[PDB]
């Protein structure tokens, strides 16, 4: 029993974190095989970021302009390329610690673990969701660029996020490991802000199913609802529309608890309309939307990774 | 910016997790140098746990009654001893992955990271606090015994918790790595329950300081309070008394924000008396008490570990 925001074991990622220095700029990089991946704004000064031309800035750099430190050992750079907003530094040494890995671009609403790092050195690990507005509510200070987000499936680390910047609202923005930003953001100091966000409906439902699996049932009712009538209440409370594909995804949890998906939607409808009345669910006074259906199954059923 | 329940990087602990089988019972063990540590109830059947005599049960076992699996390699046991509620199995191989480590018995209110494990295989990592009633609100299923809680300081892993059991309220109970239970609990199936718990006052205050460091100030006021008058409100809301040593501990955070500790106590007094009025602090509609003053400084200042 219990339900926690649970991150994946970070060991396989810790062994890939290195430090990348270009000029006076230092940030984190990800060392897989003989390539280090880091944000391309490593080549920039603060004044560059106001309006940078990265092809021009990068053309003026050499392999020896990039210092790569992996613990004590320095790594010699033998090539460099730019792919979208990430820099790929080829090095003379394959990382002996390279895990089985993939690069994945996740959909909004999916979760991942973040290994926060400074100077190539891991600081901590925590779970995040990709918000509908393609930001994340992480925990990031100056120097954290190039920290990565990931999932682990069996042996295989699927990297899905590399940190680039913090937006004025204090939420965070970054790219997939191929350098493509999530959302409309760009690696330039301009007026750009998080757009309007919404609550991830299928995730709230999953979390309500986790609560039932863990013995909380106070919020259940005998009512039901149609998908159409639910989505109308969803719109009014700034929740994302629930699709039939979302319903199908909640299949296994609905079957494990004996609560039909549309029956859980009627429960959530009442919670949105009435509030919690000073009660809590799984230790939260809010409706939690950062657990996927997969996250609930993984933690309420004890999946492991090696 | 941002504030998250942040666990330590778990890599140094992952390399110590092994599987221990005695009879039909299988659980997790911690392999440091040439010793594996696991809960001594590994030697028990379910009927044994009703009223076990561990000296008698253990006297009837041999070294070859214990199977120890570390990934693929099986480890040969060459000795065994019981220390309080932990079993120490001596093995023929020193763990090549042994980190710098210590065993620490924490005070209630301190936090640690838990690496949840099944069959010697890490499942996930999360932060816990030792509650005042010496339970933890973890996330643990059948098979998780011998999972450990820990802190990392620089290079050194300080193990502080090994998981033994789940109490009827769904909270968790276990020992230090020397086998001494936190709280009054014993490794027997009896009527024992978590006692009355309280809210960790110094921790709530620390978290209010984290919110200020992160730009939330809506809950501040111009009032002040005396330590004595605060503690009287604390008693009424089931908060722990704030000691002068607690005040001194909050020194660095009070100095960084320019808010006197007793001024933050007056803020908290008002929050307890008025509620939050549908507002949130650091994304919580509750007063959060599972961050220590150290945890706030570590995350709002970017400490790392190698
Ligand atoms: C706060 N502001 C933005 O993050 C920001 C927002 C926009 Br809109 C556009 C840019 N932009 O394009 O320059 C931004 N960066 C400003 C510096 C950034 C960010 N950074 C970090 O270490 C960092 C990471 N996470 C959270 C942080 C919170 C902080 O309070 C301070 C720093 C960070 C280093 C990087 C950099 C790039 C080139 C030369 C020097 C430094 C990029
Ligand atoms: C639920 N009940 C108690 O945990 C419990 C409570 C008291 Br009061 C006294 C004992 N007691 O002394 O036996 C308890 N255990 C019952 C079995 C325990 C617990 N366990 C786990 O794997 C486990 C860990 N965490 C959370 C769990 C939640 C679950 O729903 C089911 C299992 C776990 C295995 C171990 C064991 C020991 C000897 C022989 C076989 C198994 C110890």
Task: Describe what this molecule looks like in 3D.
Two copies of one chain form a homodimer. Chain A has 306 residues and is of the alpha+beta class. Among the domains of chain A are: 11-91, Beta Barrel (Thrombin, subunit H); 201-300, Orthogonal Bundle (main proteinase (3clpro) structure, domain 3), CATH 1.10.1840.10. Helix content of chain A is 24%, strand content 26%. The first copy, chain A, contains nine helices and 13 strands. The first copy, chain A, has a seven-stranded antiparallel beta sheet, with no helix packed on it. In chain A, β2 (25-32) and β3 (35-39) form a beta hairpin. In chain A, α4 (201-213) packs parallel to α7. Chain A is elongated, with a radius of gyration of 22 Å. At the A-B interface, α1, β9, β10 and α9 of A face α1, β9, β10 and α9 of B. Residues 25, 41, 44, 46, 49, 140-145, 165-167, 187-189, 192 of chain B line the site of one copy of the ligand CNC(=O)c1cc(Br)cc([N+](=O)[O-])c1N1CC[C@@]2(CN(C(=O)c3cncc4cc(O)ccc34)C[C@@H]2c2ccccc2)C1.
């Amino acid at each position: 029993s219990g339900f926690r925001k649970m991150a994946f074991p970070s060991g396989k990622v810790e062994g890939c974190m290195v430090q990348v220095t270009c000029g006076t700029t230092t940030l984190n990089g990800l060392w897989l095989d003989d390539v280090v991946y880091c944000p391309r704004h490593v080549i920039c000064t603060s004044e560059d970021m106001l309006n940078p031309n990265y092809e021009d800035l990068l053309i003026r750099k050499s392999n020896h302009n990039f210092l790569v430190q992996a613990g004590n050992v320095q790594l010699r750079v033998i090539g460099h390329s730019m792919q979208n907003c990430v820099l790929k530094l080829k090095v003379d040494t394959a990382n002996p610690k390279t895990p089985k890995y993939k690069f994945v671009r996740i959909q909004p609403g999916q979760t991942f673990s973040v290994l926060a790092c400074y100077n190539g050195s891991p600081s901590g690990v925590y779970q995040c969701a990709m918000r509908p507005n393609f930001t994340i509510k992480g925990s990031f200070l100056n120097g954290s660029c190039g920290s990565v987000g990931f999932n682990i499936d069996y042996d295989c680390v699927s990297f899905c996020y590399m940190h680039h910047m913090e937006l004025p609202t204090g939420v965070h923005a970054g790219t997939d490991l191929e350098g493509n930003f999530y959302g409309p953001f760009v690696d330039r100091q301009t007026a750009q802000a998080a757009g309007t966000d919404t609550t991830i409906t299928v995730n709230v439902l999953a979390w309500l199913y986790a609560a039932v699996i863990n013995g909380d049932r106070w919020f259940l009712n005998r009512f039901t609802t149609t998908l159409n009538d639910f989505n109308l209440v969803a719109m009014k409370y700034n929740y994302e529309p629930l699709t039939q594909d979302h319903v199908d995804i909640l299949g296994p949890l609905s079957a494990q608890t004996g609560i039909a998906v549309l029956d859980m939607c009627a429960s959530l409808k009442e919670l949105l309309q009435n509030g919690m009345n000073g009660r809590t669910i799984l230790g939260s006074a809010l409706l939690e939307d950062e657990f996927t259906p997969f996250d609930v199954v993984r933690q309420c059923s004890g999946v492991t990774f090696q």
